[PDB]
Amino acid sequence: GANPFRPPLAHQGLSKAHVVKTAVSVANRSAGAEPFVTRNDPRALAMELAN
């Protein structure tokens, strides 16, 4: 039948076109930035009383 079983030729494989289960998309949540409420107390200022 021209159908031998010996050849280990396992082809190339199979292309996974899609996945059975879709991947949900979560909302991106960043974090602190340059003015991320930090303590530095350089000046402490001086508020003169007007009256």
């Binding site: 991106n28 974090a31 602190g32 930090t38």
Partner: protein
């Protein structure tokens, strides 16, 4: 996870003295994970660009 026969028989007490399982025994499963992350440092401010 699957428990062991020794655990399931030591859960019930009744063991002789100096055997440890003389009293009923309770078990708690704990799972710990270790991951990666990225920390961005700029102008004296720290935050997670991705979080």
């Amino acid at each position: 996870v699957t428990m062991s026969p020794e655990s399931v028989v030591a859960a019930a007490g009744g063991g002789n003295n100096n055997s440890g399982y003389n009293e009923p025994q309770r078990f708690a499963l704990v799972v710990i994970a270790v991951n990666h992350n990225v920390i961005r440092i700029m102008n004296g401010s720290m935050g997670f660009p991705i979080l």
